[PDB]
Design a protein around this motif. Sequence first.
Motif, PDB file in Angstrom:
ATOM      1  N   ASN A 211       0.811  -1.215   0.000  1.00 46.51           N
ATOM      2  CA  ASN A 211       0.000   0.000   0.000  1.00 46.51           C
ATOM      3  C   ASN A 211       0.849   1.273   0.000  1.00 46.51           C
ATOM      4  OD1 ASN A 211       0.819  -0.476   2.708  1.00 46.51           O
ATOM      5  ND2 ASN A 211      -0.838   0.852   3.440  1.00 46.51           N
ATOM      6  N   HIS A 212       2.098   1.157  -0.447  1.00 51.39           N
ATOM      7  CA  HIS A 212       3.005   2.305  -0.513  1.00 51.39           C
ATOM      8  C   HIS A 212       3.542   2.469  -1.932  1.00 51.39           C
ATOM      9  CE1 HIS A 212       4.322   2.179   4.047  1.00 51.39           C
ATOM     10  NE2 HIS A 212       3.059   2.532   3.883  1.00 51.39           N
ATOM     11  N   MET A 213       2.945   1.781  -2.896  1.00 50.38           N
ATOM     12  CA  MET A 213       3.422   1.860  -4.276  1.00 50.38           C
ATOM     13  C   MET A 213       3.399   3.253  -4.911  1.00 50.38           C
ATOM     14  SD  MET A 213       4.850  -0.807  -4.952  1.00 50.38           S
ATOM     15  CE  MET A 213       5.128  -1.554  -3.355  1.00 50.38           C
ATOM     16  N   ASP A 214       2.288   3.958  -4.756  1.00 51.72           N
ATOM     17  CA  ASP A 214       2.148   5.295  -5.313  1.00 51.72           C
ATOM     18  C   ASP A 214       3.189   6.247  -4.747  1.00 51.72           C
ATOM     19  OD1 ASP A 214      -0.044   4.240  -6.634  1.00 51.72           O
ATOM     20  OD2 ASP A 214      -1.501   5.062  -5.208  1.00 51.72           O
ATOM     21  N   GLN A 215       3.417   6.156  -3.440  1.00 49.08           N
ATOM     22  CA  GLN A 215       4.391   7.001  -2.751  1.00 49.08           C
ATOM     23  C   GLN A 215       5.816   6.727  -3.239  1.00 49.08           C
ATOM     24  OE1 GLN A 215       1.867   5.366  -1.267  1.00 49.08           O
ATOM     25  NE2 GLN A 215       0.902   6.683   0.265  1.00 49.08           N
ATOM     26  N   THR A 216       6.102   5.454  -3.497  1.00 46.81           N
ATOM     27  CA  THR A 216       7.409   5.024  -3.969  1.00 46.81           C
ATOM     28  C   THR A 216       7.654   5.561  -5.374  1.00 46.81           C
ATOM     29  OG1 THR A 216       7.436   3.022  -2.606  1.00 46.81           O
ATOM     30  CG2 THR A 216       8.826   3.023  -4.591  1.00 46.81           C
ATOM     31  N   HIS A 217       6.668   5.387  -6.255  1.00 47.09           N
ATOM     32  CA  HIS A 217       6.766   5.873  -7.627  1.00 47.09           C
ATOM     33  C   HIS A 217       6.918   7.387  -7.629  1.00 47.09           C
ATOM     34  CE1 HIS A 217       4.742   1.927  -8.794  1.00 47.09           C
ATOM     35  NE2 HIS A 217       5.879   1.941  -9.468  1.00 47.09           N
ATOM     36  N   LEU A 218       6.190   8.047  -6.736  1.00 44.36           N
ATOM     37  CA  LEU A 218       6.275   9.490  -6.612  1.00 44.36           C
ATOM     38  C   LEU A 218       7.693   9.899  -6.213  1.00 44.36           C
ATOM     39  CD1 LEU A 218       5.284  12.377  -6.354  1.00 44.36           C
ATOM     40  CD2 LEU A 218       4.308  11.781  -4.127  1.00 44.36           C
ATOM     41  N   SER A 221      10.448   9.555  -8.872  1.00 38.25           N
ATOM     42  CA  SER A 221      10.452  10.530  -9.952  1.00 38.25           C
ATOM     43  C   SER A 221      11.271  11.761  -9.568  1.00 38.25           C
ATOM     44  CB  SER A 221       9.017  10.934 -10.320  1.00 38.25           C
ATOM     45  OG  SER A 221       8.405  11.729  -9.316  1.00 38.25           O
TER      46      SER A 221
END
Lengths: 264, 264
Positions: A211-218, A221
Amino acid sequence: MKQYLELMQKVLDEGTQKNDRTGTGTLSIFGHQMRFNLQDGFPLVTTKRCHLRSIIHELLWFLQGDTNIAYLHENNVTIWDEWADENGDLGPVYGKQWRAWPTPDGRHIDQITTVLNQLKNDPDSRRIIVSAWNVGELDKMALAPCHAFFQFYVADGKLSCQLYQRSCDVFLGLPFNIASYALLVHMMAQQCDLEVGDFVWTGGDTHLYSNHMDQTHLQLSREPRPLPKLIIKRKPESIFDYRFEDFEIEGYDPHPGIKAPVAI
Amino acid sequence: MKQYLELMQKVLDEGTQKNDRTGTGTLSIFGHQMRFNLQDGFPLVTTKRCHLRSIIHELLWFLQGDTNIAYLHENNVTIWDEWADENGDLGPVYGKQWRAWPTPDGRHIDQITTVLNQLKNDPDSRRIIVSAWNVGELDKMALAPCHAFFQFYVADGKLSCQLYQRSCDVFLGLPFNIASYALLVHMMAQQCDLEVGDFVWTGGDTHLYSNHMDQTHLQLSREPRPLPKLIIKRKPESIFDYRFEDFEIEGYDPHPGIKAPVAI
Ligand SMILES: O=c1ccn([C@H]2C[C@H](O)[C@@H](COP(=O)(O)O)O2)c(=O)[nH]1
Ligand SMILES: O=c1ccn([C@H]2C[C@H](O)[C@@H](COP(=O)(O)O)O2)c(=O)[nH]1
């Protein structure tokens, strides 16, 4: 941080699906090592804002052999509240093992002092170690130590340190674990009149929660900014005499903070 | 072995001069990690002939919690003679910590059994660890444990293991340390009905003695041969029931052995 973002990508690209304690799944890799030349700058993650305030209080709390969160509370640091019992006790965790490792014959070993003695009298020793992995007391701890074992090393007037971390939440915990030990190295080095060398981070089960995928991708970048510099305002008489106000980090210009929720 | 020769070169090219306990100088590096996919073959050095015979007896000796060299002697294994006292005792070393870690309250913890239990009932645990670094008993040991701490890890039916070695003589000790733990992984995996995964070796003060330069250069000129295969003739009822004759290595065709003297 260059080494840090590289680890994140690695977990994404090579991590295998593995679940944690009755809960969230994780992407997990086993066995990783990172090196930070402390002379290049203080290893505080810049791709997201990290607050040192609680890290410093926690470290000073460890050094005092304190195992009750009262000190943290006097300073409004709540990172251990989750584990403290009704009375504020965490059991014989870090601080207790570092300063008073109980022996079968009734003694209490001060590993911090022993290590200071070794760096000053036997710098070439290959046995300058501090362990928090006390097998006989594991059942009494609020949780088994994550950074369980670290070793010091001296060569050419430079103090290096290697930490073995059995479990590691790459997103939430790692930025903090690195800064915590890097601070300790500067403190030790100052007390022993040595320059800082490398901080070697070794991890066991290194992972990212699902549940931390979006934060990681962010975060991935973002481009790493120059590392700040750590300043110790004064030199205390002992490793046990440091105060929060003695430290100041200069040149820290991070990207916006990123929140990461946890399931319960 | 490809990973091994690369470490040797690294110590030569990057090692700093550092002396050991009132004696020989060494070329030393701090912090190194190596990975061996056990599925690719048994990691036994081929660039010089290594004898497994003593390694196997030593491992079985560790497993029995034995701390007196009598068993080794019944089998004519003399690798511990150097440290044993007049009576053949080595103090509370490896075997004692692995099978009977003494607690302050009078208990004796069997870490090998605990680890077996975890791999079978809680494979996803990030706390499957065996430590020989017993701070309270260090003064009684013939010598402080070199391979001081190891952790297991399960993912996709494969058992991996990471060893943290505080001190390492690259030429003389390392070939043996790797084979010893790689064997243990195969034994554990067999007992838990798992395939073998990776063996991750992590070292602290990794070095080459100054009087071993010629031997190192000689070995470095050799080309690694294919890795042999380990064969376990039968599956015992428990990890404590293995016998020397149960193992056989197939396809081991190494280069001539190389002797390395030590100063006294
Ligand atoms: O200093 C710390 C303490 C905890 N964690 C993380 C590791 C795991 O994600 C979880 C603890 O779980 P177990 O390892 O006990 O399973 O918290 C860290 O990253 N650093
Ligand atoms: O399993 C072992 C035991 C010992 N040694 C080596 C490490 C050092 O060269 C010396 C022990 O010295 P100290 O680490 O205590 O200083 O023997 C190994 O390589 N592997």
